[PDB]
Homo-oligomer: A and B are copies of this chain.
Amino acid sequence: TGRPEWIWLALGTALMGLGTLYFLVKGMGVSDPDAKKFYAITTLVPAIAFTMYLSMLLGYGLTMVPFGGEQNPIYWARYADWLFTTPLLLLALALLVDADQGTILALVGADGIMIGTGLVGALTKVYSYRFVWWAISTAAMLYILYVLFFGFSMRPEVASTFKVLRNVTVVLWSAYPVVWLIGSEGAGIVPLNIETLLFMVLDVSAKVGFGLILLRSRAIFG
């Protein structure tokens, strides 16, 4: 269509869809209780992103936000997506290391505050206050990364596999507040079409890429 970023949303739609079918097929046969949970998560996440990428693609998951005296296209569907996939991602890391419930609850709550305030910042029409919501969101993200780094006698296999995903998580997740900031939602240093491209690359990395990593470990099996 006219939306130059359409190509990226259409690519992202396809990769998430293809990833869901892949995990769906691979997930056939798992009987192991524990392995089951990881499989559930690794398949649910691209499945949610799929519906959200397609809603952005069809124009449903998009709104206009007036700020800086202009009507600014805002894909709220990215946030609806992250609202459900990030806690699930967090769940898989906590199950991995058998984290305590209390910690799990900290993180999930932490995470919803994170997505929640980014959404608010995205939809805020007073330009300045946008970045205020950004900073709080970012602060919740740092909280979360702090816990995954500095809060965790597991089998060496789990230790090893979690070390990897944890290092992935820091670098991926960290990238998000930077794209937002440079993209059209923030300072507008990068146009919408490059903005959409970057988030798609991260989303696919974070959805499908992360899961491909995780299900390759036998740390997920009881």
Which residues of A approach B to under 8 Å, CB–CB?
Answer: 33-41, 43-44, 47-48, 51, 54-55, 58-60, 84, 88, 100-103, 105-106, 109-110, 112-113, 116-117, 120, 123-124, 126, 129, 132, 136
Q: List 12 A-B contacts (CB under 8 A).
A: A33-B100, A35-B102, A38-B102, A40-B102, A43-B106, A44-B109, A48-B109, A51-B136, A54-B132, A55-B120, A60-B123, A60-B124
- Report A38 CB to chain B, min CB distance, Å: 8
Q: How far apart are A117's CB and chain B's nearest CB, in angstroms? A: 6
Shortest beta-carbon distance from A214 to chain B in Å: 14
The residue that A47 contacts in the complex, of B44, B54, B58, B113, with Cβ under 8 A, is B113
Q: Give the chain B neighbours of A44 by CB distance below 8 A.
A: 105-106, 109-110
Cross-chain contact of A103 among B36, B101, B123 (Cβ < 8 A):
B36
CB-CB under 8 A from A59, the residues of chain B are 126
- Chain copies in the assembly? 3
A37 touches B101 (CB 8 A): yes
CB pair B36–A102 under 8 Å, yes or no, is: yes
Q: What distance in Å separates the Cβ of A135 from its nearest Cβ neighbour in chain B?
A: 11
In terms of DSSP, what is the predominant structure of the interface of chain A?
helix
Provide the bound-state CA to CA distance between A120 and B126, in Å.
Answer: 27
Nearest-neighbour CB distance to chain B for A209, whole angstroms, equals 20
Contacts A48-B113, A113-B48; A39 near B102 (Cβ below 8 A): yes
A106 touches which one: B40, B103, B116, B117 (CB < 8 A)?
A: B40
Residues of B within 8 A of A109 (CB): 40, 44, 47-48, 88
Task: Give the Cβ gap from A23 to chain B, nearest Cβ, in Å.
Answer: 11
Contacts of A43 in B (CB 8 A): 106
- CB contact under 8 A between A126 and B37, given known A44-B109, A47-B113, A51-B136: no
B-side contacts of A132, CB under 8 Å: 54, 58
Docked complex Cα distance between A59 and B51 (Å): 29
The answer on a CB contact under 8 Å between B58 and A126 is yes
Q: Given that A44-B106, A102-B36 are contacting pairs, would A58 and B129 also be in contact in the complex, using a CB cutoff of 8 Å?
A: yes
